[PDB]
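Complex 137.
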Amino acid sequence: SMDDDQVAFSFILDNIVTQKMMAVPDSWPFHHPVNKKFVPDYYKVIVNPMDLETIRKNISKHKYQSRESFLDDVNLILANSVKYNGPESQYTKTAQEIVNVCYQTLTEYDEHLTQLEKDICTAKEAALEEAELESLD
Ligand SMILES: Cc1cc2c(cc1N1C(=O)c3cccc4c(CCCO)ccc(c34)C1=O)n(C)c(=O)n2C
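Predicted structure with 7M8 bound:
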């Protein structure tokens, strides 16, 4: 079903986060949301915060239905570090390594992720057609 596909898709993404992204050396700043007590202006500067725990919560709620949607939140971790810390910061260098490891692992599982993403979308569209047909009475 679409539900089994959603589960298989989210399982692969979660393993990318936990086995690859969270394992990047010195990735500790990125495993949780920034604590505003320690960085009081963070959420004034950064409009769309993102971190690896939040990505995992999003995966568990099946927010991501495409490789692109996932990568977009992953890219946000890096973009936010560029904005807050600058390109030359160690924070930014580490965030880039996290993004790179994500791309390399997506590459590795691309065939299966691509077929799941297609199958999920097709099932979703078919359910919507069914609902629209039922609205038409
Ligand atoms: C202080 C800081 C500055 C940052 C930053 C992240 C952090 N920061 C940690 O490094 C950090 C390390 C380890 C544990 C943490 C927990 C644990 C919560 C559950 O027990 C919560 C919050 C933080 C951390 C955290 O806010 N980022 C991404 C930046 O760009 N700056 C400038």
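The pocket of 7M8 is lined by residues 28-30, 32, 34-35, 38-39, 81, 84-85, 91 (CB under 6 Å).
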